[PDB]
């Protein structure tokens, strides 16, 4: 098992005409494998949809992925933006 | 490191024969020297003065030379042409 593989490759043809959005060298980086898309970094380790207690076939279409991400209320953020200045 | 030695520069004979310094020994900002200007403790700033990198480039390394009730003062003239 080696560590020093390249995994980043550049085609010699300069196609930098419509390429202002991708990841450039500063040429285009062409990796060996695809990317990883992660939804949220912080998990909600409580929240009994995930905790599964052992008391008492049901579905629940929860609104989006933002239930499991620990977001603060706008009341405190306004209380903190008043604490800003 | 990064320290200049205390000796081993005697660029004086070149200034004896520099023909702009008014020395009668030999014949054949806006300041010149930073003796009123600081340099913010970077020694490269002394190379901007023209009479100082003249002594760093045209300089030499010397070895140090090593060695009555009423004075009678007699002025002695020395006039020798030499090459």
């Amino acid at each position: 098992i080696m560590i020093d593989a390249a995994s980043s490759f550049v085609l010699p043809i300069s196609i930098t005409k419509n390429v202002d959005v991708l990841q450039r060298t500063d040429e285009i980086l062409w990796f060996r494998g695809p990317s990883v898309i992660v939804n949220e970094r912080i998990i909600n380790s409580g929240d009994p949809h995930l905790s599964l207690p052992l008391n008492r076939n049901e579905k629940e279409s929860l609104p989006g992925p933002f239930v499991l991400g620990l977001r603060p209320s706008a009341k405190f953020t306004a209380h903190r933006l008043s604490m800003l200045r | 490191n990064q320290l200049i030695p205390q000796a081993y520069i005697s660029n004086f004979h070149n200034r004896l024969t520099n023909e702009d310094d008014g020395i009668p020994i030999f014949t054949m900002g806006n300041a010149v020297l930073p003796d009123l200007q600081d340099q913010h403790h970077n020694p490269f700033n002394i190379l901007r003065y023209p009479k100082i990198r003249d002594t760093f480039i045209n300089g030499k390394v010397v070895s140090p030379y090593r060695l009555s009730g009423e004075a009678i003062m007699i002025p002695i003239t020395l006039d020798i042409e030499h090459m």
């Binding site: 020093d4 550049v10 010699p12 043809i13 060298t25 | 490191n1 990064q2 320290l3 020694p43 300089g59």
Partner: peptide, 29 residues
């Protein structure tokens, strides 16, 4: 386009870790 072997970009791990960013230390004329 499938005969277009690309240039590998080598990292050279010692260059990845601690390379900084000599006459300017005036002791060498």
């Amino acid at each position: 386009f499938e005969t277009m072997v690309a240039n590998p970009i080598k990292v050279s791990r010692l260059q990845s870790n601690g390379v900084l960013t000599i006459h300017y230390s005036l002791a060498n004329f």
